[PDB]
User: What shape does this take?
Amino acid sequence: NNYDGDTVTFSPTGRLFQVEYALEAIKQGSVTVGLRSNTHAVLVALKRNADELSSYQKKIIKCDEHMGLSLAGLAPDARVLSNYLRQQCNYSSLVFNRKLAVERAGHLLCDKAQKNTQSYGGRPYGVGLLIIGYDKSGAHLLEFQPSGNVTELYGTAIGARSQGAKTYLERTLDTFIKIDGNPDELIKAGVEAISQSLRDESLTVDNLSIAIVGKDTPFTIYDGEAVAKYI
Amino acid sequence: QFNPYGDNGGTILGIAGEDFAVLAGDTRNITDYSINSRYEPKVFDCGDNIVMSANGFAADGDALVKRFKNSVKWYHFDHNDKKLSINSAARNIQHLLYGKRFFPYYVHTIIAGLDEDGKGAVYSFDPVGSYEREQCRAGGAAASLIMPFLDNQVNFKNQYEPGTNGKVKKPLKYLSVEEVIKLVRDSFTSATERHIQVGDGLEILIVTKDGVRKEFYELKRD
Amino acid sequence: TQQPIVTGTSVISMKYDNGVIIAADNLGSYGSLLRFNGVERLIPVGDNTVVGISGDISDMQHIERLLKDLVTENAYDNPLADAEEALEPSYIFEYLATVMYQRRSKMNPLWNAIIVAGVQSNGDQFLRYVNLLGVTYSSPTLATGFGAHMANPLLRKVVDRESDIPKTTVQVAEEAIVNAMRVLYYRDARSSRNFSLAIIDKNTGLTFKKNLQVENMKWDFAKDIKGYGTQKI
Amino acid sequence: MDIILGIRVQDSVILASSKAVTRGISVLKDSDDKTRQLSPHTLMSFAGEAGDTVQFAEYIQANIQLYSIREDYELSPQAVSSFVRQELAKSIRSRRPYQVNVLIGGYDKKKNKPELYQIDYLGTKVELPYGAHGYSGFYTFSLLDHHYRPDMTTEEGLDLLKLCVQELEKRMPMDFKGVIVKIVDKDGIRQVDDF
Amino acid sequence: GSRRYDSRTTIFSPEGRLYQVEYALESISHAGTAIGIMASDGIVLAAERKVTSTLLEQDTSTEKLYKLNDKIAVAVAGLTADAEILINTARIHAQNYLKTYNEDIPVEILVRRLSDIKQGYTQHGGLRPFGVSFIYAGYDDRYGYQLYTSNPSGNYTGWKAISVGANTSAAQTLLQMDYKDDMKVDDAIELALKTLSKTTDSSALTYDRLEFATIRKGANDGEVYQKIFKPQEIKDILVKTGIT
Amino acid sequence: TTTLAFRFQGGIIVAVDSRATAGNWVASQTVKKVIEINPFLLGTVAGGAADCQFWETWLGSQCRLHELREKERISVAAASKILSNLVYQYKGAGLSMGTMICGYTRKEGPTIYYVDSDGTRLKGDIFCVGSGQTFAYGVLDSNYKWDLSVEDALYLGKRSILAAAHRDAYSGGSVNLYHVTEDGWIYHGNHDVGELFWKVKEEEGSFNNVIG
Amino acid sequence: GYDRALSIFSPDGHIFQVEYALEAVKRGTCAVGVKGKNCVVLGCERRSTLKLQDTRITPSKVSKIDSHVVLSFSGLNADSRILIEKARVEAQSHRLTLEDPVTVEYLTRYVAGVQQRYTQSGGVRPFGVSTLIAGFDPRDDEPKLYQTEPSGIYSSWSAQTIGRNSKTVREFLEKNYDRKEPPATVEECVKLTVRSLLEVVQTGAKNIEITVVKPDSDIVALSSEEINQYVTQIEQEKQE
Amino acid sequence: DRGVSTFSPEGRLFQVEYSLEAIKLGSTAIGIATKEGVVLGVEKRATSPLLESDSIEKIVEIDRHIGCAMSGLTADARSMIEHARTAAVTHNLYYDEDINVESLTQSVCDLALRFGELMSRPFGVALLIAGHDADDGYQLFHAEPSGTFYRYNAKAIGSGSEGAQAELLNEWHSSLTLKEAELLVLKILKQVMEEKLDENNAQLSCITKQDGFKIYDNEKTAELIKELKEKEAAE
Ligand SMILES: *[C@@](C)(CO)[C@](*)(O)[C@H](Cc1ccccc1)NC(=O)[C@H](Cc1ccc(OC)cc1)NC(=O)[C@H](C)NC(=O)CN1CCOCC1
Ligand SMILES: [Mg+2]
Ligand SMILES: [Mg+2]
Assistant: This one.
């Protein structure tokens, strides 16, 4: 009310309203799903279009050969953060000849988003991210929020009506976690998960976006006729 | 006073065919009169069917290859996974080299691959970014020994058609991958004989549309 | 632009079937003056890497602190700091190699020659060199300073190429190293009798040996040598 | 760049400037005009280090022209020379100084008097009846000491100038390919085409 | 953050006016009246001191009239402290011009630069403008005797006779009535004092409540002299014109 | 290097050799020393190879940005001055460039501008630049007339490079000819000195110093 | 440094500071530009509430940017000096690098660019000034007349007016100016410019300034008597 | 007042949303993409008849293979075009090749959100960036001040945008010729324009692989206007 003018102000109940309004931009964003097994990690993203004449907004971004994310909210902010991740992944390679750990990737994003919520003039990032990766400790899935809070999960989903996919994954937890050495079946579980968040619309060929990383699989994105297999 | 440069010796060689290209380089690494390594590769696969070697001062050489490899990576990120053409790579390297015009990379750089018509391509650079596409180039310590031999055997220089009274030149033609590798191996054995910084081993990287293949051969270890 | 003051001499090393050996004497020379005799020039990083450093000792002590600080930094927010995400020799080397080249490029080098010996997580032997110029190279045998001229020839008789590494045992490899250290003591005017030796094996792990001495030396033949040519008495 | 002369007479200032542009063992050009018009009644000839000369001359020209537009008024030859001197005086203590020597010939419309200023690359300004830069002076000064009179006409000044050029062509080691002569008076600046 | 407390000094009103410039002019309208009158053979500067106290040291005082160089002077109306900042800048600018060209600065050039400084404070920086209006009285060999005025807006204009500060409306009407182009300095001196005498808020105009100055060519042959009047000299000129 | 370009009745001739040197080592015999900036502008290059190559290619970018911004092709004067002002900023740093900006525009007509790395910029009708410029001057000056035909002018430019290619140890390889008209530049082929010399010797009856 | 975003968008999609800068232009004294067949004429109003002025030294309304281009304006006088100064510097800078004087379009484009920059730079307000930039390109006899405004938009005009009561004089010019046949001579163009100002000014004494620009740097300002002759001629023809 | 980079309760940036309202006030600009080329057309909208309409430059060249049309506060586009041109030429210098239309658009859109308390406010102008490259062929992009860009088969921006976009929805198919597309832009422009459409108050342009980016002359557009009127009366 009087305490939402900028990010440097606390409310009387101890809330940061600008951070909460930035969180609101994610709920308006299109749904995206993340899930993993012990061998592979999968991102499934429902892309959104302006109208029938427009293209479908690309949701998934590659950060390195072994890491990448999907976005939900302000796309330019996702571009800024993904670019930062690309540099940090690349710094780890050039200097230490070492693939950046997915856990550190999350820690770095948290600390970057935090600085924006404590300083005058700047603003919080208006986007949520789902980072997947495969490093020295196996497959991983992270959930980034622009408050700074990063969380490691077996599966999750963010965006509009993400509660449907998140409940499904919470039920299916025991099943999909053991889909080891099988990419197509893990994707199928992700495509079935995102389907729980659909209303009126269904998954078409230029609507669906899938990405995967794993043990002997670099981070690769599938769009267009390549995802027709899973509809 | 501190001297930031050094000479790690060795020598490299690039030859272009019709539908292929080779980039060869000996595996010896030296400083002064000591051998540092008998097998230290300096011909690298940089992705997008581009092989590269920066012979001379190894620290600057490794630094440059490292930066170009990174340049290829960011070209994919910034331009929707587009393949970096050999001509584009060459121009990019010129800017890397010239970027340090007033504190140069002490290296003779050579890259090889296929052009956008699928034909074999060899580009070669000076230490400050000057470049030129050729069918043929030797670089490094024994370049002065090998290069004239290539002029004679690859581009058929000073060779005339027998009985034509030195009027008709020997016609230019592409060489087979088998014939090129013969010239490479003879070039390096000859260079090993007369140059002290060249020897130990020979590593050839062959580039066709199918990908990048490797071949290794022993050289004299004295 | 530097000049080295207190200096450390040869660091020698080689690969064997299960790991690597590295050694370096305990002397801190001040020109021709053999000033400091208790200087450790082998510095372990974790339980799987040893960094051997020659050249300027002040710069060596700086590098010590950087490695010490690297272990600390790696442990931060890292539950697998003593497991999957532990510091590898290849990580430690590349870090130093980056630093060495950056410093030479700023015309203010760390006046050293460094050998990073260790064993990777997958059991592979790691042995690689880097110096003040940022020059890097790897070989079955590596040595700095006089070691390059005298040790390498002896160590290469044992392991002349890659295929000789599985054929070389730790007993044979260590004997060659200890012999090389003796030859260096005979012939290097800035070397000492006392030295340290480290073995990084993929099975038995890190074995750090201190206060070793060069022994079984041949000096007896000296008594027969009279004058410099035409002297009989 | 080498020979630049200046002679102030009764009603005008005459500037002679060599046409040769040499580099190494080759005369690259034999028709070079080593001068710029700073304002309608002010002319500056220049000589010195390659590149610096024109770069400096044009920089001054731009500044004076900017002043003329701003005030809708022509700056006096004295004022222009003082501005030029200060620029060279700054220059000499810079990281890379302009190595340019100049002569500023101008006609002051308020005083109705011709004025000739000699300024070297250090910023050493002097008003003179006749001036020269470089080795030229070693011949022309003594020659003008003898033959110069303060009440001469422009035609007499040109004959006096011919006498200098002849002496230089006789005794100078280098071929400077003749001179371009320009006259500055009450009616402005004009070039003598046949010299 | 700090945004909360920003007055935003350099913005437009809906009508297209600069709030702070307008309010600075309202401030100046309460300052002691200053008059400038330009004659064919010189210039007069007259100014009324702000409600003088009997214990104020009058002879060793300078409130209204200031010297910029040998050829140019100014009359001040507004905040004295503000004016002195601008005056020292103007004095330096004049000396820079002399140093560069070996010629005394033309009046308009000095006026423009000082006016450009004021303009800057109305367009950028977020600071309040200078609450000062000047009357520039000077001479150069191009335009001869010149009168200018500048105000907080940074806009300057040339005048034959002009007033700034308080009661300028009444003062400008009286000047417009009695001024003519073939006027002499001694006549302009009389006009300046008569105008102040009628527009003054005081009961009667006296020597202790005035600053006075002239810029004549009254020196020996083709050269300009600045005369900042002494208390006794103002007392004499006030009696001579028949005001006291 | 040896490069020349001269103005005449029928436009501008531009001729260059193709040799690159690293001391007495012949680095290349097939190098391009004419940069095609646009259909109406050419730039010859002599001196440091990278300096020339890098900054002339850069000049072409600045000329492109000019015609995008101004909706009009850049003048030869303006193009040459962009380059001369650039190298002047680097004066003392050790750049080595001897260039000649040749081209045609409506307002200027055929124009040649000599620009070098120490900041000299000169308009002129005839210029020869490079290690063998003196050799080219000797042949060019002694045969030059304004009224030369397009055929004779092309040959004189070719013959002047050949003369320098012969005598100058740091020039040779092959001759690259160009002809600039009101309609733009026209390429007139690459001419290897290996064949061209004997062809010229026989047909012209010159080069009697050589063992025929 | 002072950073505040003064020029910003409002709910309805307007930048009020730019629009309030236009109000300052509307307050300013009228300025008119009319271009003929071989010339351009710049007319300017001078308010007559200021007597006892010194017209010798008072800044003239029309300013020379170079010898071949001029700039008149309407709005804040102090602001106009800053634009003129920048334009004059850029004019000399262009001659220095391109070896050719600026085109009227280029100079206009530069001035408009400066004006625009102040509409989205922190800590600054827009210029309360619109300009009329007129002249002839180098070696060209086609007359050029351009207009700029605080927002940064610019465009070419056959004839145009700005300032107070400009909508009245624009109404006059819109019916009186023929595109197919512009003022053939200098006299015709000046007369039409004076006529248009006489709809608004008050008296044709020392209230109207006229400046005539012709090809090849031929610019001259008309005196009182010369302008007064046009005023006398127009009024006699009017009584009909 | 309030911050420049402030979020609304609905999760949108106030200043970005307000700048979109400014773009709705702007003149209409239409772009149509085909396999034979991309066509760009704009409403000039002269504020007065004395204004010389040929000086209204709302269609602009970025490179030989990329064009641009604008709508809204068109003064703000100057620095966007300048950046685009530099980006295009710079990439050609570094890589000896034409730059991808998407990469160019992305470069322009990186400026968009570089505002706050960098420039003081978002841009008040939307751009239609049309071009061609070897990879993805003929492309049309809509670049907003939000930093977002969508690829379109056809797109209308400006005051008559929603009415024109609904018309483009029905009319567009994947087998349109260039000539058909030219007429379709003219047809839709004439429908949404206040004043009557002619060669002086409306401008056409196109980009083809062969001839590159070309702004049409008033003589050429006039014939296409005459051809359009005849074809509508013919049924
Ligand atoms: C003739 C052959 C004189 O040598 C020409 O000037 C020729 C011109 C030319 C133009 C474009 C492409 C290739 C060649 N110049 C050279 O071949 C040039 C000669 C030269 C070498 C060094 C110089 O020092 C500044 C100046 C001129 N050769 C080179 O540039 C060679 C290929 N490169 C080097 O020597 C590398 N050096 C250059 C200077 O910086 C350190 C590395
Ligand atoms: Mg040997
Ligand atoms: Mg030769």
Notes: The CA atoms of residues 137 and 202 of chain F lie 23 Å apart. Residues F 165, 168-169, 171-172 surround magnesium ion (ligand 3) (CB under 6 Å).
